[PDB]
Subunit: 337 residues, 4 copies
């Protein structure tokens, strides 16, 4: 039977990334990438929490505070991420939500990883301090061809590492790799991410659905039937509670932690959904799957879609397996031509 | 004005509060109270963001503490507020959501104000880093008898100051008093709330409705008809967007900034409503009216209700005047008899 | 007292200052001034500790700034103090070490106090992370004429409040006023100075002498004889320990806490002394006398000197009463004629 | 001739440690060690800067704040270092200034490095906020014998990595390895150490000597002659300035940055000096040498001494090469039997 000695342990992200990189016997290029990533997130957390806002408001006379307008969070975050990653000498191509074109890393600093990220997701709404975050996805470059936007166009099934940082009431980094999903809490007093949850698995079935019902008018009959069954359960059991923030990271994170289902279906206006494929759906789909949930467009898996455009959009539904399944069946029941 | 160009100096809460105290020719007792809530909010903020969590997870060796259950945030928060409050020498009665009874302050620290608060609102949801907050309502004692639970039972109309702090992507303090509502952004680098928005006013009409539709099966006919008109406008106008965090300060705050309507009426498991009157409804109503919005229960104004119990619940509907008005109209159409 | 056991509540600077304002039945103008110095000290503290340096070193991409010379600390500090000072509406004249002239405040912001300060003392030594500080002296304006440089030229005996903040291994504010000296420790997690030491008094006699002996070749015979007696006691008692940081606030502060004597007399390249009267000598003298120590030039008390120029220098010797007394005795033995 | 493309770069300690570890083709065990070390320093910086002091002073009623007395800085720092290092699975033996005996790392977490450290050096004096720091030295374990105190007993010449962290007005980490010395500044807003000085070299000759002259009575004739020549230069040039804090890290750091000489000679009381060999002298000697300075006991090199006790002491003189040399000659001039 199992037995044990004495072991007290504090696991920091940095420690974790090195160990895993050691187990994997990697050259350490990816380790440098995750490290640079952790450093990017920390710098975005401090900006999002508003440290320094006083300088923008004339505490030092604002003689020298190029913030005012010449320092928006959306862009600063893009800048920080772009710069910190090129500075890792581990990436060859970067796809950001903020850049129309793929960034092709200078020959001098090229590495083999492709990184698709959304610098400050849900930022449109922080005027009212809504939870925001950073979503990222990492692919290995396969072609021996000169790096190009093309290398970013790989299904989500090909992700080597994927995750997000949630700048909520506290800052969390969720990292998912082949071996699994782990959650790290940022201690902002020492600037270290402490593994607070190891090997995260999502509930089989949850009690919360998450969707923007203002679009009810434009919802396809499958969603309509699902939602109605959530509110008025035929078996006269308890209806699902409802919550929906409007920031993907916040909604998906809650879904992961408490279970349930998140949905941002296709509706005529955004006939192919609103959420972008490469740096929102894919990374979240990958995370969901590593934790044991499902992520579908309604017709097919998100991770199996092959993009033909970096800024391509895709509908998406994710959450506990028994719930996504219950909705997939409903899609099959109405599925035709 | 003699001559003043594009100028705007830095105003800290502390400076602001003191000016207003002098304008009011106060003895400085309320100022010490406001000063103490500020400090209280700053300490909770820090604890919310998880500064120092490393220690809990054994970074310096968990020598011999009684597990992980050392500092439960809602309780730490309760402690901080109560203690920095008693230390202001400005309070005689304190009513807390975490306490079954009203807390009567020792005559040595006994002052004239009665303070109602919710130290950490939305704390059950904290596991998923959702924005949480602190709500406070301040009453001037209007009696000659020993302070008691009774001094807290005054309608919200008798409030002298009310506000809240939202711990979201950034910490913000919204303070409402006789003249208007003002918003202070916390610059954590220096422990100071900077005045970023003054004499705030909610939009006349908004485009977002906030309600937990997981209760649609239990809503009254007016709420039902109302929710239905936002989704499928009878006059074929654009439908209202939907958003509901499930945490009040974040929901009420999004409502104040962008406009729209927030609702928490009674249902089949909370006939009196879920939100508490003294420390949840009244403070947000007072802020709403001061911002130029409305706060109704569907049939009467929240501030006019006469409490009979300190932990009394009450339904509430608050937001932009034109939306709250519209729902009231609907509530009249279905009138009782 | 009625009955009070082992009790001691938390006192923040803000709370303290306000209480003292009420006891003094002030109009609250000095309080706004003290409040503004506090905030000023907190912002400098943060800039000293290097919070946000990453940005300067290109973490978010040095887009197009004019090099590394963006924010020179002594200048940032100057700016902050001056601006948060003018914004208190409590100052008419400001004298700064960084400014050749006295700064006369616009009549709109014009108040009654005159503030002398050294925003960042010991800044040339900052390259090697040595403790630096801020020194302030506050004079009540005693004239009827337009405020001018002249209102600053009052002997230290006319100071209403004086103190300093030391940015060492921790930020501490030492404040001296009519009643006594009190020390506030900055808890950076919450932007609050906690009262840790009240009504402080320097030791009658100490065991450390502080002087830059790199000037032994230029010292007068009394200083020389004095330094000699501490090293080789004539009565064969234990010799005094030596310590000299080369930064005043750190040297004066070590002197206040442990006792002993600090000296900065004239030599062969500074006949008037090196330390400035208005914003270096006077504040530390006032604090020293309030703590129960002495501050002499060797021949006269520092607070009694009548300034003729705002950037006037003066030798100074301060510390425990019995040590300062001993040196004065020696200065008499070698008297002039 | 030399030419170049375009390169913007931010180097964090973590990045630097990984690259160097990659160049060195190490298994990555040492990288994990330096990483754990960086995390230890950050946690000590936050404690030293006093974050959380308010909880000790009853802000939350102190209901749960096991600080008071049951949380001293000296020990906490020891605890943090000991724990964080054992948690790296890279050390087999630890020698701390605070532990009488060598700590022998559990078989389960043994690695091959020996670490000799002083957790909070100069701590005796932080009551007056004097600069303090952390000094560390790392040896590779050579014996194939079970780890023992013995493995710590190696001359300083055998150090693989050595350095210190200075908790001054800002926090700096100085890391010296075979390839050289680099200085990293801690950005406490993001918790990252940014390389601010690359390949540090000390001035050939400095203008400052650093020594505690209170012991003049007991100084050997060599020191006596040296010092006198510093104050009264025979060539009638400028005398050396004098500075001496009383915290080794602070004095040695200043010496490194501006040049000069630091001395803590043998004097009857501490006939073999006061500074301990293994975790004060050795690490500082190693740093000095990698930067091009000298470190001698007066008779022999510090790095060549073979210790026979972990807590052994040793006299020490270090600084610019031309000055240490000028004193070594003076030792030779008086050298006899
Ligand atoms: N920190 C790490 N965690 C998990 N796998 C890693 C890690 N580092 C390297 N690997 C694996 O090793 C591969 C190559 O490592 P590398 O040579 O550094 O590019 C990566 O694509 C990973 O699949
Ligand atoms: N910001 C303020 N500070 C102090 N008093 C205020 C302030 N704003 C309004 N007042 C009024 O002043 C009254 C009494 O002053 P006090 O002696 O401090 O209790 C309060 O109850 C308020 O109605
Ligand atoms: N802490 C304090 N706050 C305000 N006034 C004070 C304080 N301590 C002493 N006083 C006295 O009050 C005087 C005038 O009050 P004021 O109207 O605010 O200018 C000052 O110049 C002081 O002599
Ligand atoms: N980060 C690093 N910087 C410099 N040298 C290193 C580093 N990592 C490993 N090495 C060298 O490689 C040796 C063995 O690496 P390791 O196998 O990890 O124990 C060490 O003793 C070093 O001399
Ligand atoms: O308010 P909507 O239309 O439901 O869109 C919100 C979605 O858009 C985003 O703000 C950006 O794509 C997401 O974070 C979020 O889930
Ligand atoms: O999940 P429910 O039933 O909608 O409760 C949510 C409401 O409860 C609260 O936590 C307070 O009781 C509010 O913050 C929030 O808006
Ligand atoms: O190096 P010196 O000549 O002793 O000057 C040091 C003195 O100068 C100051 O920086 C102020 O001029 C003080 O802080 C300090 O004690
Ligand atoms: O005051 P002294 O006797 O010169 O000793 C100070 C020395 O002792 C320590 O405090 C500890 O060994 C050192 O940091 C410092 O250089």
């Amino acid at each position: 039977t199992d037995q044990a000695a004495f072991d007290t342990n504090i696991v920091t992200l940095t420690r974790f990334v090195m160990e895993q990189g050691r187990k994997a016997r990697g050259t350490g290029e990816m380790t440098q990438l995750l490290n640079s990533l952790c450093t990017a997130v920390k710098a975005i957390s401090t900006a999002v929490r508003k440290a320094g806002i006083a300088h923008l408001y004339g505490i030092a006379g604002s003689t020298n505070v190029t913030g005012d307008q010449v320092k928006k969070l959306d862009v600063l975050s893009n800048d920080l991420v772009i710069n910190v990653l090129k500075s890792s000498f581990a990436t060859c191509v970067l796809v950001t939500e903020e850049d129309k074109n793929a960034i092709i890393v200078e020959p001098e600093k090229r590495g083999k990883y492709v990184v698709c990220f959304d610098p400050l997701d849900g930022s449109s709404n922080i005027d009212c301090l809504v939870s925001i975050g950073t979503i990222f996805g990492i692919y290995r470059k396969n072609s021996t061809d000169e790096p190009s936007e093309k290398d970013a166009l790989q299904p989500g099934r090909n992700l080597v590492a994927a995750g997000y940082a949630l700048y909520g009431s506290a800052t969390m980094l969720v990292l998912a790799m082949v071996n699994g999903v782990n959650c790290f809490m940022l201690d902002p007093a020492i600037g270290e991410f402490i593994l607070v949850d190891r090997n995260v698995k999502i509930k089989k079935k949850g009690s919360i659905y998450s969707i923007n019902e203002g679009y009810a008018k434009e919802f396809d009959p499958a969603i309509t039937e699902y939602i109605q069954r959530k509110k008025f359960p035929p078996d006269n059991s308890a209806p699902y509670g409802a919550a929906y923030v409007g920031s993907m990271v916040a909604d998906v994170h809650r879904t992961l932690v408490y279970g349930g289902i998140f949905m941002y279906p296709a509706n005529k206006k955004s006939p192919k959904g609103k959420l972008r494929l490469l740096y929102e759906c894919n990374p979240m789909a990958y995370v969901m799957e590593k934790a044991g949930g499902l992520a579908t467009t309604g017709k097919e898996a998100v991770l199996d879609i092959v993009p033909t455009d970096i800024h391509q959009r895709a509908p998406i539904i994710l959450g506990s397996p028994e719930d996504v399944t219950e909705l997939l069946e409903i899609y099959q029941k109405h599925a035709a031509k």
